[PDB]
Amino acid sequence: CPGESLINPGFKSKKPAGGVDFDE
Amino acid sequence: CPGESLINPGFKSKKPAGGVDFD
Amino acid sequence: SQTVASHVPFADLCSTLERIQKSKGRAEKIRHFREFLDSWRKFHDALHKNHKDVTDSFYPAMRLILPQLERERMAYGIKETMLAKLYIELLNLPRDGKDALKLLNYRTPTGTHGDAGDFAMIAYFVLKPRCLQKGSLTIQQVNDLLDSIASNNSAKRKDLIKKSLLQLITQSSALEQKWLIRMIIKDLKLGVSQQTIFSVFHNDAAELHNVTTDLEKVCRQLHDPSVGLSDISITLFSAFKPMLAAIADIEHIEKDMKHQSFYIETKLDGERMQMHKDGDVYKYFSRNGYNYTDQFGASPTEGSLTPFIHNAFKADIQICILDGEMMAYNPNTQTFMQDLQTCYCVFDVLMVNNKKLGHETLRKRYEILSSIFTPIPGRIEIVQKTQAHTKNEVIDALNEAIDKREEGIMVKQPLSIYKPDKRGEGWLKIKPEYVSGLMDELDILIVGGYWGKGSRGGMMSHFLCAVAEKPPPGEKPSVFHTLSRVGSGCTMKELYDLGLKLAKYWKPFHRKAPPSSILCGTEKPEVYIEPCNSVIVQIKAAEIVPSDMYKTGCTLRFPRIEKIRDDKEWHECMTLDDLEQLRGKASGKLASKHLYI
Amino acid sequence: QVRELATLLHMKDLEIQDYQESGATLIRDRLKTEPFEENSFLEQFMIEKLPEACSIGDGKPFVMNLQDLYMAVTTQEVQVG
Amino acid sequence: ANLFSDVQFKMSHKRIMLFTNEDNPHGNDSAKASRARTKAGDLRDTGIFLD
Amino acid sequence: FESQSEDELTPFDMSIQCIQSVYISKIISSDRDLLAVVFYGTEKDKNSVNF
């Protein structure tokens, strides 16, 4: 299934916390 | 094998008697 | 007189059996069998609406589905080899063709064609292109033909059996033929326990079947699920399964005994039999509900025991039932044997006169067994149970039983009741094989091997073992004498490991050209291995008894594989001097050490 | 050449039907192929691939793929007369 | 085949003669044709000579 | 059972004639041989297998 973490199957992969990202 | 009689296997089919046939 | 079995084509039953086999979840199998039973019951009820009485409702169905418990007809007399030979003869297959060899040598996996373990699947594969697609046989016709073949086998007629098998083959397809082969072999592989089948059939079918031991009575009585039975107990002239003593722990006996007094008796290693006497008529049944009255006689006029036991019963006794063990006795040496006379030793009683004593405690049963007749040595005996309430008493009893070359001992609670079909409920057995450090274990070599069947199909199941002979000093033995066959004592993982290790070292054996190194007796191995490449196998056997099927002349009773000794080299095989020394140490049972704690 | 290929396909299909009738089962069905029909294959090809295959463009595909056969045909023609 | 097996004597030659004028007795059903072919094959393997 | 042309015995008649000739020849040449006649494709059936 797309967007599935390769480490723990059945769990949703999450990108690293980007913190505060001010917009243009 | 060739010439075997279909009635009595193992015995060659004897040719029919012809008698005397002058040349 | 209409029968439901005639209106149900065998195709439906075969399809249901196939669905049960393929299904994995037990719930699915239960659902399939339940729906089939419901359909059968509905059809039976609808058909017999006009008729106010019924003679048979579901007996043929259970008889076919449970060939193991079939009792109405005698043994067919055919099995894997005979069935394969009959199939080859009937189908006119080539004697030495691939199909014939596969059928006869179904165990051998050399053909590597599908499953090589079960004969039924090989038969199905060979018959797939020969039989039709849809059959035309009804369950009633199949049952008729089956009882016909059974009677013909009992009638000593072979041509009629061949004709019946020809008709069965002609009027069936591949799937039904495979199923019928399985049922003739009496092995269905449904994967469902008997208890589940009886429970789904009816709420209290198992108890009734155990009490009566008949697929006909259970079907006739328990038909409507709504209606049940209140009074169920042992019935006159009815076969009932006996108890079986489970393994007894030798550390918490009192806990199993509730700390109360317990009865200890010597073990009787004979034929378990049950007797029902009513005036003149005597009936004798075996452990598995198999009639044995013919050998022992149903009347005092003829038989082996009835003429001697009829006069030994009290005059006030008319109807009675007992259960005991059957052995041989020798008047020359005044000893029993595991010229000779049949001897019956009784240890329990179920019914006497017109009252039922199944629910009575063991104390009352033993009192009745002590006041039921006048025992006479050599013919009729009563087990002399001894009361005990300490570990010392039981250990002393076991020690003296071992000294007397006895199989073991049995322990019972006086308050126990007689519940048929129970494993180690109130009765327990203690024998030297069940306690570690009491067997003169043996270390042997494996020289042969027979291909397995069923689950252990594509692998090595059991091996033929041989013992080495005293060689010249400094020279390893090269001549081996076959001793026995060992198949048990191993699991799948280690057995597969052994097969893998010696997979490439196996060599086929030829009867007309036996290998010089290995010497074999009556029994021969399918595949043989030279002694130089083998593994030391540990075997613990209850006893060693004389025989003629092996060169050494002795065989191990209940042999086992205790482990594999890799550290012990192959050359360390024991010699025949060891065999004779062990045999002469006690002349029979291996156990000769006193257990003290 | 196409007719030869079609008849060879027919022979292979006859062998395949014989194998199937011999009561043999495939270990893997992922490789299973279906029977071949000349009419169905021709119609499918004409509907699907003809627009791309028949395209010549500037003539490159001819010199790329159809030169050896051209050589043989021209040699045969000159040999004839 | 059953008729041949019935005889109790010793047969030096076992022969069958088919008097038919149909090229394809089983053309509609392939299964019947395959069954006939295999049965003929086993009959030949047994030792029966078919003409 | 059909006559492709007039004055022509049907295939069944020809087969019957051949069978009769073979029977007569076997009567004299070797009377110890075994001969059987089986018909297939008829509505009636008579076999040990009850086909």
Place this chain on the structure above:
Amino acid sequence: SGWESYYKTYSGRDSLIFLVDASKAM
């Protein structure tokens, strides 16, 4: 109607195995 109308017809733990080539090309 005869024998026609009366008859019809998150758990466990994940596992992983690492397979690594040992050829000189790696």
